[PDB]
Amino acid sequence: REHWATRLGLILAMAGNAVGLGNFLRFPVQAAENGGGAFMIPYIIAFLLVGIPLMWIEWAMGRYGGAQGHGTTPAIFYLLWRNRFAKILGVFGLWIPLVVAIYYVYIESWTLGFAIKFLVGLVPEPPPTDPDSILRPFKEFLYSYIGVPKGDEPILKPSLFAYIVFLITMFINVSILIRGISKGIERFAKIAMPTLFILAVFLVIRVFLLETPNGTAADGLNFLWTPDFEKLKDPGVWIAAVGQIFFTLSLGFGAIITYASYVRKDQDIVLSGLTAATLNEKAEVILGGSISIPAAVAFFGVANAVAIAKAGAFNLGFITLPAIFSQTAGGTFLGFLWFFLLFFAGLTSSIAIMQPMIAFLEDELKLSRKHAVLWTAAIVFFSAHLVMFLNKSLDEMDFWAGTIGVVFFGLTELIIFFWIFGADKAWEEINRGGIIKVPRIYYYVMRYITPAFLAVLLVVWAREYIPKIMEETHWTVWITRFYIIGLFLFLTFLVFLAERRRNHESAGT
Amino acid sequence: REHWATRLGLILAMAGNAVGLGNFLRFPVQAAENGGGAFMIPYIIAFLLVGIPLMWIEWAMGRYGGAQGHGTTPAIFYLLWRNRFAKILGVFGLWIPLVVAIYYVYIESWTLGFAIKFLVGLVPEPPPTDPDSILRPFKEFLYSYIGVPKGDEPILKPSLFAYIVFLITMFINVSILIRGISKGIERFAKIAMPTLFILAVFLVIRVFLLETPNGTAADGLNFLWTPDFEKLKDPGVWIAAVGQIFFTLSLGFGAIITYASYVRKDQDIVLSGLTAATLNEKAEVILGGSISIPAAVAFFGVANAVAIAKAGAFNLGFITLPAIFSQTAGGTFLGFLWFFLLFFAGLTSSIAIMQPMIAFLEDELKLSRKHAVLWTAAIVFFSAHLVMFLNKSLDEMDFWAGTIGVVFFGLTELIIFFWIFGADKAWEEINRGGIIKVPRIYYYVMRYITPAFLAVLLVVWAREYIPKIMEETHWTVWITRFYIIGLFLFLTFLVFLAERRRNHESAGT
Ligand SMILES: CCCCCCCCO[C@@H]1O[C@H](CO)[C@@H](O)[C@H](O)[C@H]1O
Ligand SMILES: CCCCCCCCO[C@@H]1O[C@H](CO)[C@@H](O)[C@H](O)[C@H]1O
Ligand SMILES: CCCCCCCCO[C@@H]1O[C@H](CO)[C@@H](O)[C@H](O)[C@H]1O
Ligand SMILES: CCCCCCCCO[C@@H]1O[C@H](CO)[C@@H](O)[C@H](O)[C@H]1O
Ligand SMILES: CCCCCCCCO[C@@H]1O[C@H](CO)[C@@H](O)[C@H](O)[C@H]1O
Ligand SMILES: CCCCCCCCO[C@@H]1O[C@H](CO)[C@@H](O)[C@H](O)[C@H]1O
Ligand SMILES: CCCCCCCCO[C@@H]1O[C@H](CO)[C@@H](O)[C@H](O)[C@H]1O
Ligand SMILES: CCCCCCCCO[C@@H]1O[C@H](CO)[C@@H](O)[C@H](O)[C@H]1O
Ligand SMILES: CCCCCCCCO[C@@H]1O[C@H](CO)[C@@H](O)[C@H](O)[C@H]1O
Ligand SMILES: CCCCCCCCO[C@@H]1O[C@H](CO)[C@@H](O)[C@H](O)[C@H]1O
Ligand SMILES: CCCCCCCCO[C@@H]1O[C@H](CO)[C@@H](O)[C@H](O)[C@H]1O
Ligand SMILES: CCCCCCCCO[C@@H]1O[C@H](CO)[C@@H](O)[C@H](O)[C@H]1O
Ligand code: NA
Ligand code: NA
Ligand code: NA
Ligand code: NA
């Protein structure tokens, strides 16, 4: 089985798995919509009671499965719980990352497309003070790129450039993945992460120099880091914070588990896991939190900045920030650096979310790495046409897989590993070979607190937030639901084939 | 490998494969729309130059593949032409029947649902002379059953009864298929075909007694059997006739090939194939042609009857005929007998079109018959939800698979078998073990005439009839196109897995 070559490589690859679009695009919007400072308390708590513990648990499950030649959940869940239902629940560990990849790689391709256009200077020209006269050109720019509906039909018409850039993006993902864990992903991470860090720091510095009649970047930081305890009673803020924690750390995606399946049996995961997690949090709150929000607040003030964040999920990063940059000397190039940053952040994450399917095809169906990578790319490429052309399909997939799915799967993996497999056996497995030991208190957090925390969250979620959304949607949401349910059925069939191949092979030996 | 137990069983199963909804629903509409008698000349010619020859060719290919343990085209095409492209082209032999099954079984379920409701008397009550006051209740009846759109959204809302009946229908198909070729399909055919014949004859007799101020059943027969040579120059009529010939004989579906793969290596296929084909033609022109059209003409006259046929594909069989029957004593029960006839005709055909996928899973992926049948039913059941809920999805699938697909595949199988594999080797393979020999003239028809006939047809088709339809359709057609293209990709992936299992198994022996 492949293995990470170096400790540093392992840490940077895991860091790249986590540090992505979630840090620079998702976090700012989530924090801004939920009162900035009021979002941070629940966020910090969620990191300590959910983020950290689940991270160790996934690293442990992955290393454990890898030692037996298995890197994905259908097999690993079965090793931890010899029950047919374990294999079925394990399918979510392939389904969630596949579905997220289907829309994540497309958004990633937009950042490459924008980077290219900003680099060559093929960008809108704002009319040298009206805020709408400056923002409109950038909104039209994004709308023409992805092809937002002008009529009443829920259809998108992406530009030819956008389509070709998606193809190029898939090619780049394949060019890294096809070389494997050590020579592909690990080698790339050592180049991408340092670049990402430098670009991010530079951008924060440039943003910190912004000052207008409406405010300064400093005002943005105070809005984000000023606590509002009167919001700690709001369930919505807790749901938002926990959701962000899962997404940003790649938890419940089956991705951390698959990467960890390449860690040697004796190798530490306690310190390595904690380091990867801490690196992501720094990139998120210090870098991601210091670019978009402060820039928006400085130019528009808090009230307007928050309104912009609520406007959409892409408004801030694809329309507002470049518009703001366009008002400064060298602003077009700064826009290029922003999109290039987003691209590398996205790329290091998309290779991580597609590796689970690759690992399954290699480990369970015995496909060569080449064939496994190519078929995975084909399924993602084909499936992405739904997100490219059907308005709101992206939103639907992000909801079921990227929001509900990850939380549900996180609770599922915890219950299989810490309750069914055995709390003490699990604790023993996590600490084995550790450079440091997990604080004793976390044994009780993992066994009682984390699972109770998530169970409640999911309950309040399903009875006070979904009944409304799961009934007021346009009929076209069923097209996406139908298709992703089919993807689940397809993956279940592959797991069935994998078990039949195992039986036949065994009976032959 | 399984084999048909008796010669009679083989003939009745093949006859059941062919005699279906195409005979009683499709033929009447096709003939009526294309000038009745004017349709029959091209139809007869198509049967002689296309129907008969391709039938022998498919039986030959199937028996040939079966002798080597292969019943589906991905493998058989490869045996006839050792080229990777042969395996890919062969995928259509699994894709076409799967797609047709996805809508065919649903229409079949409607006949069971209607049979049930007509039997118990839960049918509309026409107001005891206005033609619309009598037809409207039956139109509303069908519309409420399948859930035709009342607004502008292209969405269907089938009744709960219709949905449950579809489930029951799938169960019945599974209950026959799971028992296999001899104890399942063959045993059922010996019971279904005789029943079908008796019900059909009885219905023809009852229809022949109809006489109204507008005409008699006799007028219907003269409309159908009176030649109109001024239409022999119309390409559209030729396309219609050839299309019906393929559909009614199950040619280009990969279904005749799979059934023939269970015929013993030495067993005759010349006489058996010809008999199955002739039986279908009798059931089609004599039985199918003598029920719907004569009844409609007798009550409405020719002009109105033709208009009704053009109105829709289901108008005549699900609305008009029962409406006509309702005006006669015992008419509700006659309606029950009609739908029961359609159900048995459909059932004997749906088991035939689902067997190719079952044979592939058993032959190439080594699944047990139980597992192969259940997974096939699951894929069809799941996929059918698209046809159940998206208006016109059924039409789109029928077009690509049931109309264009079968013709294209028929030309493909002929060129692989008679040109690539070898005209003389093919001719030798067809006649081997024959109780009778194929007339010498057919050697030249198969090698030069049939392929030229179809090639021209397809060309005129693609440059004078599709450019118009492939551009004026509602955007929702892309949902169905997207999904069935995905089905093709899925099946291609399974063929890829089958070849890898073969390689690994071989290297182990
Ligand atoms: C291999 C899978 C193919 C699926 C069909 C894809 C059809 C995409 O079609 C392409 O879309 C682009 C973006 O709108 C357009 O700019 C191109 O002109 C158009 O040909
Ligand atoms: C790095 C890869 C860059 C690929 C550039 C693709 C440019 C697409 O090509 C452009 O498409 C436009 C919309 O259809 C047309 O109006 C332009 O004339 C055409 O040049
Ligand atoms: C890492 C990339 C994350 C992209 C986040 C996608 C979120 C799903 O999509 C977003 O949903 C919001 C609420 O329904 C809408 O207001 C936004 O307009 C929409 O883009
Ligand atoms: C779910 C995947 C749907 C893929 C549908 C792709 C349709 C191809 O793309 C469409 O082609 C038309 C004709 O050239 C153009 O008029 C449309 O603007 C273009 O979007
Ligand atoms: C709610 C989660 C809080 C996590 C903070 C843990 C801080 C670690 O706490 C330390 O753990 C060591 C090992 O068990 C003990 O020996 C120390 O006395 C204790 O202070
Ligand atoms: C392939 C497309 C399948 C669509 C299935 C639609 C099932 C009906 O879906 C319903 O349609 C109503 C009217 O639009 C909406 O108001 C409801 O919210 C929606 O759930
Ligand atoms: C296992 C695959 C399940 C796919 C979701 C199917 C949802 C069907 O839903 C059912 O449709 C029927 C017909 O309109 C209605 O009468 C039922 O009330 C409704 O629950
Ligand atoms: C042979 C199998 C027969 C199954 C009969 C199913 C009858 C469905 O049940 C009926 O559905 C209607 C529409 O939702 C309701 O209005 C009726 O009250 C209910 O009894
Ligand atoms: C054996 C069952 C055959 C069913 C025939 C389905 C034909 C596809 O569907 C039919 O297409 C016609 C032309 O586009 C329309 O006029 C009909 O209303 C439509 O039902
Ligand atoms: C392509 C397959 C689409 C399956 C969509 C099934 C949607 C379930 O069915 C829908 O449920 C709604 C709420 O109960 C009802 O209001 C709708 O009338 C009903 O059609
Ligand atoms: C265009 C297709 C026409 C098919 C009709 C074939 C009628 C059979 O024709 C017969 O075939 C025998 C065997 O070759 C010959 O010995 C006879 O002389 C010949 O009349
Ligand atoms: C999942 C749904 C994907 C839909 C892809 C639609 C691609 C655009 O498709 C085009 O839309 C036009 C406007 O409706 C129609 O007039 C054209 O005939 C149609 O080809
Ligand atoms: Na992250
Ligand atoms: Na990343
Ligand atoms: Na037929
Ligand atoms: Na039949």
Is residue A193 within 8 A of residue A15, CB to CB? The reply is yes
Angle made by CA atoms A423, A426, A427, in degrees to the nearest 5: 85
Q: Which helix (H) or strand (E) holds B180?
A: helix B180-180
Distance between CA atoms of residues A97 and A357, nearest Å: 8
Data resolution in angstroms: 1.9
CB B111 within 8 A of CB B130: no
Rounded CA separation B80/B73 (Å): 10
A433 φ, ψ (degrees, to nearest 5): 75, 5
Is A255 exposed, middle or buried (CB count within 10 Å of its CB: 0-12, 13-18, 19+)? buried
Which residue, A23, A108, A92, A16, is CA-closest to A384?
A108
Q: How many CA atoms lie within 13 A of B96 on its CB side?
A: 31
Residues preceding gaps in chain A (C to N > 2.5 Å): 128
The chain A residue lying nearest B501, using CA atoms, is: A501
Displacement of CA A242 from its chain's centroid (Å): 13
C-alpha Rg value of chain A to the nearest Å:
22
What are the structure tokens assigned to A252, written together? 């419940």
**Contact with chain A for residue B437, Cβ under 8 A:** no
b/e per residue, B290-307, with b = 16+ CB within 10 A?
bbbbbbbbbbbbbeebbe
Q: Does B497 touch chain A (CB under 8 A)?
A: yes
Question: A9: how many CB neighbours lie within 10 A of its CB?
Answer: 18
Tell me which residue has tokens 């004796």. Answer: A266
A23 Cβ neighbours under 8 A, 6+ residues apart: A248, A280, A283, A284, A287, A288, A345
Q: How far is A293 from chain B (nearest CA, A)?
A: 39
One-character DSSP codes across B72-136:
SHHHHHHHHS-SHHHHHHHTHHHHHHHHHHHHHHHHHHHHHHHHHHHHHT---------HHHHHH
Handedness of CA A456, A457, A458, A463 (dihedral sign): positive
Beta strand B211-212 with B215-216 is: antiparallel
DSSP state of B437: P
Q: CA B77 to CA B72: how far, in whole Å?
A: 8
Contact B272, B14 (CB under 8 A): yes
- B124 phi, psi to nearest 5 deg: -60, 150
Rounded to whole angstroms, the Cα distance separating B282 from B262 reads 25
Chain B contacts of A485, Cβ < 8 Å? 382
The size of chain B, in residues, is 509
Q: Which of A374, A379, A380, A385 is nearest to A174 (CA)?
A: A374
Contact B1, B69 (CB under 8 A): yes
Residue of B411, B360, B384, B336 whose CA lies nearest to B483: B384
Give the nearest partner residue to B508 out of A383, A386, A508, using CB atoms: A508
The verdict on a CB contact (< 8 Å) between A366 and B479 is no
Taking the mean position of all CA atoms in its chain, how far away is CA B401? 11
Q: How far is the CA of B260 from the centre of ligand 15 (A)?
A: 17
Q: How many CB atoms lie within 10 A of CB A151?
A: 6
Q: Any binding-site annotation on A84?
A: yes
DSSP secondary structure, B471-482, as one string: TSS-TTHHHHHH
Phi-psi region of B438 (alpha: psi -120 to 50; beta: other; left: phi over 0): beta
3-state secondary structure A392-454: CHHHHHHHHHHHHHHHHHHHHHHHHHHHHCCHHHHHHHHHCCCCCCCCCHHHHHHHHHHHHHH
Q: What are the CA-CA distances from residue B385 to residues A494, B144, B157, B473, B486 (Å)? A: 22, 17, 11, 21, 15
> Amino acid identity, residue A428?
E
Q: Are A244 and A50 in contact (CB under 8 A)?
A: no
Distance CA B253, CA B406 (A): 6
Residues B458 and B469: their CA atoms lie apart, in Å, by 15
| Residue B366 falls in which region: left (phi positive, over 0), alpha (psi -120 to 50) or beta | left
Contact map slice: B 360-399 vs A, CB within 8 A: 365-367, 371, 375, 378-379, 382-383, 385-386, 389
Is the Cβ pair A500, B153 closer than 8 Å?
no
Q: What angle do CA B498, B503, B504 make, to 5 degrees?
A: 100
The answer to whether A483 contacts B483, with C-beta atoms less than 8 Å apart, is: yes
Cβ atoms of residues A219 and A290 within 8 Å? no
Q: Is the distance from CB of A304 to CB of A42 less than 8 angstroms?
A: no
Residue whose CB lies within 8 A of the most ligand 10 atoms, among A477, A478, A482, A484, for a mutation test: A478
Q: Does residue A445 line the site of ligand 5, with CB under 6 A?
A: yes
The technique is: X-ray
CB–CB contact B382 A490 (8 Å): no
Q: How far apart are CA A290 and CA A293, in angstroms?
A: 7
Structure tokens at A126: 């704002």
Query: Quick check: B386 and A482 CB within 8 A?
Result: yes
In this structure, the residue with its CA closest to atom 6 of ligand 2 is A161
Closest partner residue to A497 among B153, B155, B365, by Cβ? B365
How many helices (H) and strands (E) chain A has is answered by 28, 2
Residue A376: closest C-alpha in chain B? B493
For residue B268, what are its two tokens?
Answer: 């005759």
Q: How far is CA A199 from CA A10, A122, A248, B237, B355, in A?
A: 22, 22, 19, 68, 59
